[PDB]
Design a protein around this ligand. Structure first.
Ligand SMILES: CC(C)CCC[C@@H](C)[C@H]1CC[C@H]2[C@@H]3CC=C4C[C@@H](O)CC[C@]4(C)[C@H]3CC[C@]12C
Ligand SMILES: CCN(CC)S(=O)(=O)c1ccc(-c2csc(Nc3ccc(C)c(C)c3)n2)cc1
Ligand SMILES: *[C@@H]1O[C@H](CO)[C@@H](O)[C@H](O)[C@H]1NC(C)=O
Ligand SMILES: *[C@@H]1O[C@H](CO)[C@@H](O)[C@H](O)[C@H]1NC(C)=O
Length: 990
């Protein structure tokens, strides 16, 4: 019942679709020019949507997951801690930079950095046309006023008395829409600390940012010239150290006459030196690079150093967000354009090359700026696209031009390339009309689309090449379209399905890439059906009139089943319609396949050769699967010549120890929840469930001696790690300095002693900015440590996880969050495996269902599934073997590999099934002779368009090219060599 009825319905539907396409081709043949002009007009109207093109530049949006826990941690850190923007300025040289002349020049360079002036007209965030002051909640404003008043009063008083605070454990709700009464009695230590989330002042008023300048200007209500008159310098937005700017540079040694530039520098400690005159700290390890010293006379005498680093701290608050964002920009223009080669020319080098001195810069603005620059498509990508288009045009012309000119189809190939390009343009325009923003990966959308947009073309030509016997050109075109309609529709539908399923991934970059590719493929399919088919009709009319393109242009200026046919041909071979005419489209290639390749495959020697070769390939794939690596470094997304990558390379070169600045934070859950109230498919929610335990980070007694000893042991363990070079933990210093005083374990005593140590001690004065006390209880704190830089992301993620394990203190319900910039990318690399393993399964199931709906028989579907699984296994094994890691690009291409390879596999299998040969060998011969041309062409075209990406300056594009080339190579080999042999051996017969 079910088997009969479902198969009957399927066959009836397929036959009706074929007849509909037959009649559609018949209708198109009468109106080719009308279809051409209408399709072109529609494509241009859709392309007009490029005027609404937008780029997505947020790194979190592009690369992070939707519910990334790193995003939540960054939000918490910014809401409750005072971070400072850090501008790094590095200077490299094959010449030692410690000579007095170069030192004087670099001092002038630093003074120039200090002397940069920015006018208020450059503050793009105050343009008199924005709603920049959103409404802050009323209770928050009242609390901010009360807290600033209390901070002023406490700072004036300068007394620490924890006798009035309540030290009892908080309730589950935090007790001993939010009411101001609960918040109005909060006392914060240090007294100048107020939660940065509460500092929401009018950013466009100069009084809120520059009190000293005494100007009362509303930038949203000020003219452009009036704002341009007023200027500010570095000193107005720079973090202060004893009043002066808190510069971290070599020239702190010479400050206030402590040392002299001409004389050699002598320092009593190469790790932490305090300038006696200025009382300012300085770490020579972080400043100087390839440092060479003497260590004589109980001190260290530094002779040479081939690198110098300077760190400029800028205030990082809401009100100071734009101004710094302005100054940093100018700072970059001051560094990337600075030249001091004149002095360098004379001095002796290290590498014996021409002497050199290069300045590098890195800011928090730099990554966003580089992403913005990358978002626009560069000239190199356009040149590569042009070269790929030229290659595919040459290949198509070479295949479709033969000895006889009027039987050739060059115009069809050219218009097929044009159909691919127009489909890409129309799809991109439609999605821009829908509002989807263009991610940088979309730069690779054109190539791929063209690489697919030609495939259907070849298939149609194949059918039109096989129907030379039909004298009626209109009926010939109708039958050609009838034969090729199911194949073309299934191919495009499968590609669209694969890309749409890929678009489900949480990362917006992949979602946009897949959406653009799917829309472009759909519109390219429509263009193939109309624009290309009309040109096919025109060239068929010219062929019937026996005039080629040139003669036709001159005159215009003057003015039966194919399987049955191949079976009959092979039966006649056992001894007008059987023999192709001279100069046919695919005569020579089919002759080569039938005369040489088919006898090789049918021979026993060919079969055993193929079996041995593919056994070796599968074994190599398994061994590669054994060598599996995961993760890609983020900077690979940028070109090597970008100043960010150059700065990173240099830093790694001259400063191996100071690789990553990992920051470890502890937040009290009750405090965080109390102060947050003022603001008002994929289950890989990693690093979130652990931190949400009901009994963690709540009312932790820091006065406990056991907990302090555990903290000391944790610090020692963190120092013991090989990948950790230095640790800056103020809590450890406090505990080491004071042990007898803390024996009482009294919470009030602990609070008072910690406050006094922070307020009075020199090291405490340094660490004052890393601790938050509310109502006499330490509610949040932090420390930092440096991690060796490594080129492998997987080992870096392992180090971060080891650090998270070390910071865990389950005995006292304490776990500290470890954070870094690379944490987001590590989270993405950890989630990509699960995301891909889900998407691949969903894609495979859907594609198998779709192909089983169209493939005749059930055993053929099993063969197709086995071939698809083997192709995927080989692709993954060789991508692991070739050093490609399991990253976003490789995983997405692995997902799409099913949709790409199913086309060739289905072509060969359906050609085998529909044939009427008696033995398996005859059916294999017919299947090859019919559909080995299109299968080879549809892969060679895609690879020819893609190959130009091998020279792309962006490593992500290179990985894309490599993985796609592996996919295409394995699909072609398993569809043209392994599949025919497998069908000859065990293929179905009835
Ligand atoms: C002389 C002995 C007894 C004490 C000196 C200890 C040294 C190694 C410690 C104490 C103070 C520490 C600094 C305190 C604060 C900061 C700011 C932070 O953004 C980076 C780390 C940095 C710069 C720390 C580096 C290490 C440091 C300099
Ligand atoms: C550092 C901040 N970034 C995180 C890496 S990012 O802004 O999100 C970012 C991400 C990627 C690129 C990029 C350039 S070329 C490129 N080819 C590419 C081609 C095809 C596919 C499927 C993919 C994924 C990529 N992709 C550029 C920037
Ligand atoms: C703290 O305040 C209480 C309440 O007035 C007072 O009794 C105590 O002496 C104060 N402690 C100090 C050190 O001033
Ligand atoms: C504000 O008032 C009550 C009484 O003090 C307080 O307990 C509660 O937090 C608030 N009431 C609400 C939210 O209904």
């Amino acid at each position: 019942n079910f088997i009969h009825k479902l198969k009957e319905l399927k066959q009836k539907s397929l036959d009706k679709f074929a007849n509909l396409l037959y009649d559609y081709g018949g209708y198109v043949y009468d109106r080719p020019c009308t279809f051409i002009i209408c399709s072109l007009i529609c494509c241009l109207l859709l392309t007009c949507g490029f005027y609404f093109k937008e780029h997505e530049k947020d790194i979190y949006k592009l690369y992070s997951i939707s519910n990334s826990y790193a995003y939540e941690t960054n939000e918490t850190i910014n809401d409750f801690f005072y971070k400072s923007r850090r501008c790094f300025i590095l200077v490299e040289s094959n010449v030692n930079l410690l000579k007095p002349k170069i030192l004087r020049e670099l001092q002038k360079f630093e003074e120039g950095t200090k002397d940069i002036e920015v006018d208020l007209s450059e503050i793009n965030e105050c343009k008199t046309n924005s709603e920049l002051p959103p409404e802050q909640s009323h209770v928050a404003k009242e609390l901010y006023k009360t807290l600033i008043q209390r901070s002023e009063e406490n700072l004036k008083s300068g007394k620490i008395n924890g006798s009035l605070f309540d030290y009892s454990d908080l309730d589950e709700n935090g007790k001993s829409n939010v009411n101001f009464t609960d918040y109005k009695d909060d006392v914060f230590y240090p007294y100048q600390y107020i939660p940065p989330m509460l500092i929401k002042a009018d950013r466009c008023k100069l009084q809120n940012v520059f009190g000293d300048k005494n100007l009362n200007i509303d930038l949203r209500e000020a003219s452009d010239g009036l704002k341009k008159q007023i200027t500010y310098t570095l000193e107005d937005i720079c973090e202060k150290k004893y009043g002066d700017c808190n510069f971290s540079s070599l020239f702190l040694y010479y400050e206030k006459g402590n040392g002299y530039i001409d004389y050699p520098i002598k320092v009593d400690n190469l790790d932490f030196y305090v300038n006696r005159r200025t009382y300012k700290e300085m770490m020579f390890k972080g400043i100087l690079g390839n440092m060479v010293y003497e260590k004589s006379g109980s001190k260290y005498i530094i002779k040479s150093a081939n690198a110098i680093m300077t760190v400029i701290p800028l205030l990082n608050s809401h009100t100071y967000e734009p101004y710094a964002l302005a100054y940093e920009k100018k700072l970059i223009d001051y560094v990337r354009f600075y030249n001091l080669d004149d002095i360098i020319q004379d001095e002796e080098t290290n590498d014996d090359n021409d002497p050199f001195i290069r300045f590098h810069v890195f800011t928090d603005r730099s990554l966003e700026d580089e992403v913005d620059r990358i978002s626009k498509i560069d000239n190199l990508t356009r040149l590569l696209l042009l070269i790929g288009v030229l290659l595919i045009f040459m290949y198509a012309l070479f295949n479709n031009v033969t000895s006889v000119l009027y039987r050739s189809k060059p115009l069809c190939a050219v218009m097929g390339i044009f159909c691919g390009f127009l489909g890409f343009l129309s799809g991109s325009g439609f999605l821009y009309f829908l509002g989807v923003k263009s991610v940088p990966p979309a730069e690779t959308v054109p190539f791929l689309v063209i690489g697919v947009g030609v495939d259907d073309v070849f298939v149609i030509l194949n059918s039109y090449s096989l129907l030379f016997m039909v004298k009626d050109n209109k009926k010939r075109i109708q039958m050609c379209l009838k034969d090729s309609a199911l194949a073309i529709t299934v191919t495009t539908l499968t590609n669209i399905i694969a890309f749409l399923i890929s678009a489900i991934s949480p990362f917006y970059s992949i979602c946009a890439f897949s959406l653009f590719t799917a829309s472009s493929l759909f519109f390219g399919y429509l263009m193939v059906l109309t624009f290309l088919l009309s040109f096919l009709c025109i060239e068929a009319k010219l062929e019937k009139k026996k005039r080629n393109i040139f003669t036709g242009t001159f005159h215009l200026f003057r003015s039966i089943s194919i399987y049955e046919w191949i079976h009959n041909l092979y039966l006649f071979e056992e001894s007008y319609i059987y023999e192709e005419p001279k100069g046919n489209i695919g005569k020579y290639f089919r002759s080569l396949v039938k005369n040489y390749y088919v006898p090789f495959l049918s021979s026993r020697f060919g079969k055993t050769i193929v079996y041995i070769m593919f056994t070796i390939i599968i074994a190599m794939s398994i061994y590669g699967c054994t060598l599996m690596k995961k993760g890609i470094k983020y900077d690979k997304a940028f070109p090597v010549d970008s100043y960010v990558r150059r700065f990173t390379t240099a830093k790694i070169k001259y400063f191996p120890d100071f690789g990553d600045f990992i920051e470890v934070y502890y937040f009290d859950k009750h405090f965080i929840n109390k102060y947050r109230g003022l603001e008002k498919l994929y289950s890989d929610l990693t690093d979130r469930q652990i931190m949400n335990s009901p009994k963690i980070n709540k009312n932790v007694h820091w006065e406990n001696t056991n907990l302090q000893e555990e903290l000391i042991n944790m610090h020692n363990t963190l120092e013991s790690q090989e990948f950790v070079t230095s640790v800056a933990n103020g809590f450890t210093f406090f505990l080491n300095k004071n042990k007898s005083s803390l024996r009482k374990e009294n919470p009030q005593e602990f609070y008072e002693i910690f406050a006094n140590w922070l307020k009075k001690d020199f090291v405490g004065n340094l660490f004052k900015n890393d601790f938050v006390f509310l109502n006499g209880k330490l509610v949040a704190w932090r420390f930092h440590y440096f991690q060796k830089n490594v080129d492998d992301s997987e080992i870096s993620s392992k180090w971060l996880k080891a650090c998270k394990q070390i910071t865990k203190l389950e005995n006292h319900n304490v776990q500290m969050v470890c954070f870094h910039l690379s944490s987001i990318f590590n989270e993405t690399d950890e989630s990509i495996i699960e995301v891909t393993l889900i998407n691949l399964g969903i894609t495979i199931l859907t594609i198998l269902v779709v192909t089983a709906y169209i493939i005749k028989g059930f055993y053929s579907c099993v063969i197709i599934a086995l071939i698809i699984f083997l192709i995927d296994l080989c692709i993954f094994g060789f991508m692991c073997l070739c050093g490609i890691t399991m990253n976003i690009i490789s995983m997405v291409i692995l997902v799409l590999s099913v949709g790409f390879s199913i086309d060739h596999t289905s072509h060969i299998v359906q050609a085998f099934s529909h044939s009427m040969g008696r033995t398996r060998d005859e059916k294999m011969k017919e299947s090859l002779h019919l559909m080995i041309g299109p299968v080879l062409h549809s892969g060679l075209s895609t690879w020819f368009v893609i190959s130009t990406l091998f020279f792309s300056n962006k490593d992500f594009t290179v990985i894309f090219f490599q993985t796609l080339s592996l996919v295409l190579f394995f699909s072609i080999t398993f569809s043209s060599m392994f599949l025919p042999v497998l069908l000859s051996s065990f293929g179905p017969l009835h």
